[PDB]
Design a protein around this ligand. Structure first.
Ligand SMILES: CCCCCCCCCCCCCCCCCC(=O)OC[C@H](COP(=O)([O-])OCC[N+](C)(C)C)OC(=O)CCCCCCCCCCCCCCCCC
Ligand SMILES: CCCCCCCCCCCCCCCCCC(=O)OC[C@H](COP(=O)([O-])OCC[N+](C)(C)C)OC(=O)CCCCCCCCCCCCCCCCC
Ligand SMILES: CCCCCCCCCCCCCCCCCC(=O)OC[C@H](COP(=O)([O-])OCC[N+](C)(C)C)OC(=O)CCCCCCCCCCCCCCCCC
Ligand SMILES: CCCCCCCCCCCCCCCCCC(=O)OC[C@H](COP(=O)(O)OCCN)OC(=O)CCCCCCCCCCCCCCCCC
Ligand SMILES: CCCCCCCCCCCCCCCCCC(=O)OC[C@H](COP(=O)(O)OCCN)OC(=O)CCCCCCCCCCCCCCCCC
Ligand SMILES: CCCCCCCCCCCCO[C@@H]1O[C@H](CO)[C@@H](O[C@H]2O[C@H](CO)[C@@H](O)[C@H](O)[C@H]2O)[C@H](O)[C@H]1O
Ligand SMILES: CCCCCCCCCCCCO[C@@H]1O[C@H](CO)[C@@H](O[C@H]2O[C@H](CO)[C@@H](O)[C@H](O)[C@H]2O)[C@H](O)[C@H]1O
Ligand code: SF4
Ligand code: SF4
Ligand code: SF4
Lengths: 78, 157, 114, 178, 115
């Protein structure tokens, strides 16, 4: 649902998030393995998506969005 | 000295007398010590005949009488209402609890003397001090105010 | 090693509650900074929340985690209700406390305490 | 046995007389007038106020006031540093040190009372075996600093020398009750 | 002229007392002193939020009853009329309908405050 337009906004959010090195950020970069974040960092990132896309992502859903891509698939499947 | 210094000194007396003669304490009491404060207002001692009138608003009060134990949970609130009294303002610490923690000095929950929170002008000992002992301390505050030399000090600056 | 659970049957279920409480504290910081007129940034408030959560990152017992969350929800409640005052919230930052030095030599100079 | 404070509900019929008396009471505020009568009657009563500090409230020989350390009629201190007062003090307001005096006497070198810890309970003067520490009759010793209420031995002995004439007479009046 | 003169003096006296009260005393402004009072704890919200009015119906009834007395205040001039019977009937009818209006609102529980 605006599939590529969504991706433009998602990566915008992750670049603002300081803990992510902006060069290493790619649509398939796993938050834990690649970017080297931790569990609470991920929770803040999904909360940031909750702000941009204006809807509630449950704990059960948000626990899975482990790299930028699945966020996009989750959002489009709204 | 000079006639300008004499005039300044007489003005100090006049403004000092006015504040001596119209001391309005906050309606503010914490524990058993406040009961003896009621007895100072009661007919036998009638604090109002000295010009002492309780007002509930800190904006309309000159004296804080810390009449009882000051707990850690109460300390910020007491500091708030002290800060909201317009100046010139005075504090009378009444009873062992307010003076230094008293019977509860060693408690985890008690401030060991209200003079860790606010400046204190008069310390009234006792647990509780009698209504008369409190009245004596109020009259000692008046004599302290009688000694203020703010205009003389301004003149000599 | 057989114990009654409190709320969570395993540390994985407990971690879920921890993340919910963290979200609630994270969203509350900007409202608290604004309503209490705290002289700190929102970023500084959220860093403090993070540091308080990581003070307990080593806990593995699901029951202890359950009780840490229960207490964390209480602290959140007295913060949202403004039962805590500014003095209470600013206590988390220890702004008048000189921290104890961590090296052997500095402690040796100061006194006898380890 | 019990009584009802507000069970007067024996409902009855109303005559014209009682209905008019009820009407007069409502419309002419009669019970409110009785209230004014009471406050008027106090206006013409002599007030109970005394002219402090020229007049004083009555007290009794048992009154627990400012502490003092007493002497024997010779001038020798009564306190022999037993520390019973220190042990019993419910506020731990008493601090004592002692050693043999130059003449070998058992006497204190420290006798402190934190008057801002003390609860003025009189337990020390009950516990003293030699009537050394007493609460005297003085209650007018408010200070301008906290530090002035941390009494040491010199202060407490000066209170004894200051107030012994009244302290002795109060003990003579009450000791048979002790 | 005289009424203008005395009321200006009344205004002048009040404003002078305000100026004295604000410029004579020693000041000491700091944030905790000037924060709003609420019994030693901070307010949890603005005092500017809505404050419910439980007597709102009595309040707007008062608007109508205040124009009723405006219709009654010419009565001292009206009793001078030759047409005494007409004036008396008009005044009696006016007072009676206002009473009936009050009686109706009373029996409708319009004077009871909302809960
Ligand atoms: C404007 C209204 C002012 C009217 C009041 C002025 C007099 C107030 C003092 C008073 O009456 O109490 C006497 C007081 C009464 O004594 P007291 O107040 O200290 O003691 C009261 C306690 N008992 C009851 C036990 C006595 O006399 C004094 O000792 C204090 C001296 C105050 C002097 C006041 C200022 C003097 C006038 C200076 C005018 C300006 C000079 C210009 C140059
Ligand atoms: C119905 C009542 C309405 C009227 C109310 C009027 C009441 C006042 C009655 C008159 C007395 C007025 C005295 C000032 C009031 C007190 C204000 C105050 O305390 O400020 C303190 C201030 C404090 O000064 P400061 O410099 O020490 O303070 C510095 C900063 N802090 C506070 C941090 C220390 O002092 C003044 O500014 C005094 C100024 C007034 C000086 C008196 C008049 C000059 C007389 C000179 C002598 C002339 C001789 C000529 C003949 C020879
Ligand atoms: C407006 C003036 C209202 C005058 C009402 C009577 C009060 C007279 C005493 C205060 C005078 C204040 C003043 O103008 O000071 C000069 C002002 C300073 O005002 P201020 O801030 O010092 O006023 C406080 C006065 N004392 C110190 C007595 C508390 O300085 C200027 O020149 C600014 C113009
Ligand atoms: C020929 C033609 C004749 C025609 C004229 C007949 C006139 C008859 C006289 C009627 C006078 C009545 C005046 C009105 C006051 C009144 O009666 O109202 C009573 C009022 C309510 O009383 P309450 O007990 O609350 O019961 C409610 C139902 N009545 O209760 C009150 O109003 C009391 C309020 C008082 C509040 C205290 C204030 C101080 C009072 C002391 C005043 C001293 C001066
Ligand atoms: C305005 C005044 C309104 C009309 C005043 C007349 C009321 C009156 O008569 O007072 C009656 C009162 C007695 O009280 P009560 O026992 O209730 O009377 C029984 C009546 N069936 O009488 C008394 O209480 C005795 C008088 C004591 C009060 C004396 C002061 C008079 C106060 C009236 C002045 C108001 C100002
Ligand atoms: C064309 C422009 C002309 C130049 C203009 C310059 C304006 C500068 C104004 C300086 C402030 C004067 O205004 C006054 O300052 C004093 C002390 O300074 C403060 O007054 C009060 O508050 C402070 C708070 O600590 C106390 O220190 C002070 O003693 C007390 O009187 C207030 O702030 C104000 O009452
Ligand atoms: C639904 C609402 C009901 C409430 C309203 C009821 C209004 C009815 C009013 C009835 C009373 C009228 O009362 C009436 O007063 C007038 C004067 O005012 C009297 O009139 C009398 O005096 C007047 C002078 O004023 C003479 O000029 C006249 O010839 C003579 O009759 C009448 O004799 C009397 O009947
Ligand atoms: S000093 Fe004594 S009387 Fe006063 S509040 Fe404390 S315990 Fe009560
Ligand atoms: S009066 Fe009571 S509290 Fe005070 S010193 Fe004696 S024993 Fe201690
Ligand atoms: S004052 Fe009395 S009880 Fe206390 S140490 Fe001296 S002798 Fe013993």
């Amino acid at each position: 649902l605006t599939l590529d337009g969504i991706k433009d906004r998602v990566l915008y959010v992750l670049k603002l998030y300081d803990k992510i090195d902006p060069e290493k950020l790619s649509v398939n970069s796993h938050f834990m393995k690649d970017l080297g974040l931790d569990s609470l960092d991920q929770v803040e990132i999904i909360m940031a998506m909750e702000d941009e896309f204006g809807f509630e992502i449950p704990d059960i859903d948000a626990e899975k969005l482990m790299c930028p891509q699945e966020i996009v698939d989750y959002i489009a499947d709204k | 000295r000079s006639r300008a210094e004499y005039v300044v000194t007489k003005l100090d007396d006049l403004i000092n007398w006015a504040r001596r003669s119209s001391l309005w304490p906050m309606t503010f009491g914490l524990a058993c010590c406040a009961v003896e404060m009621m007895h100072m207002a009661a007919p036998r001692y009638d604090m109002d005949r000295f010009g002492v009138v309780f007002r509930a608003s800190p904006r309309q009060a000159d004296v804080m009488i810390v009449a009882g134990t000051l707990t850690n949970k109460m300390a910020p609130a007491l500091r708030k209402v002290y800060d909201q009294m317009p100046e010139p303002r005075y504090v009378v610490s009444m009873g062992s609890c307010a003076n230094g923690g008293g019977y509860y000095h060693y408690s985890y929950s008690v401030v060991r003397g209200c003079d860790r929170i606010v400046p204190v002008d008069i310390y009234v000992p006792g647990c509780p001090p009698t209504a008369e002992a409190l009245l004596y301390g109020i009259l000692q505050l008046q004599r302290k105010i009688k000694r203020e030399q703010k205009l003389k000090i301004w003149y000599r600056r | 090693t057989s114990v009654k659970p409190i709320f969570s049957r395993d540390l994985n279920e407990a971690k879920r509650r921890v993340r919910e409480l963290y979200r609630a504290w994270y969203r509350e910081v900007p409202n608290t900074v604004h309503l209490m007129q705290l002289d700190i940034t929102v970023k500084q408030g959220r860093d403090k929340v993070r540091e308080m959560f990581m003070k307990n990152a080593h806990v593995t017992d699901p029951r202890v985690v359950d009780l840490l969350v229960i207490k964390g929800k209480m602290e959140l409640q007295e913060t949202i209700k403004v039962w805590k005052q500014r003095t209470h919230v600013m206590r988390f930052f220890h702004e008048t406390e000189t921290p104890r030095p961590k090296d052997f030599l500095s402690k040796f100079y100061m006194g006898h305490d380890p | 046995t019990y009584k009802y404070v507000n069970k007067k509900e024996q409902e009855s019929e109303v005559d014209m007389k009682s209905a008019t008396d009820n009407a007069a009471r409502i419309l002419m505020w009669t019970e409110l007038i009785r209230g004014l009568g009471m406050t008027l009657s106090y206006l013409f009563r002599e007030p109970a106020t005394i002219n402090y500090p020229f007049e004083k409230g009555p007290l009794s020989p048992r009154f627990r006031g400012e502490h003092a350390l007493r002497r024997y009629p010779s001038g020798e201190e009564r306190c022999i540093a037993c520390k019973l007062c220190e042990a019993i003090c419910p506020a731990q307001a008493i601090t004592i040190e002692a050693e043999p005096r130059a003449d070998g006497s058992r006497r204190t070198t420290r006798y402190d009372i934190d008057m801002t810890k003390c609860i003025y309970c009189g337990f020390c003067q009950e516990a003293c075996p030699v009537d050394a520490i007493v609460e005297g009759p003085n209650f007018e010793f408010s200070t301008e600093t906290h530090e002035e209420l941390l009494y040491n031995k010199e202060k407490l002995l000066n209170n004894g020398d200051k107030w012994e004439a009244e302290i002795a007479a109060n003990i003579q009046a009450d000791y048979l009750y002790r | 002229m005289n009424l203008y003169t005395v009321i200006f003096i009344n205004i002048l006296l009040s404003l002078t007392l305000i100026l004295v009260a604000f410029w004579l005393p020693q000041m000491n402004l700091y944030s905790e002193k000037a924060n709003p009072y609420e019994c030693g704890f901070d307010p949890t919200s603005s005092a500017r939020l809505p404050f419910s009015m439980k007597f709102f119906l009595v309040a707007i009834t008062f608007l109508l009853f205040d124009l009723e007395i405006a219709l009654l205040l010419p009565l001292p001039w009206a009793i001078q009329t030759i047409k005494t019977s007409t004036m008396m009937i008009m005044a009696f009818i006016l007072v009676t309908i206002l009473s009936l209006g009050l009686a109706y609102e009373w029996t409708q529980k319009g004077l009871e405050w909302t809960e």
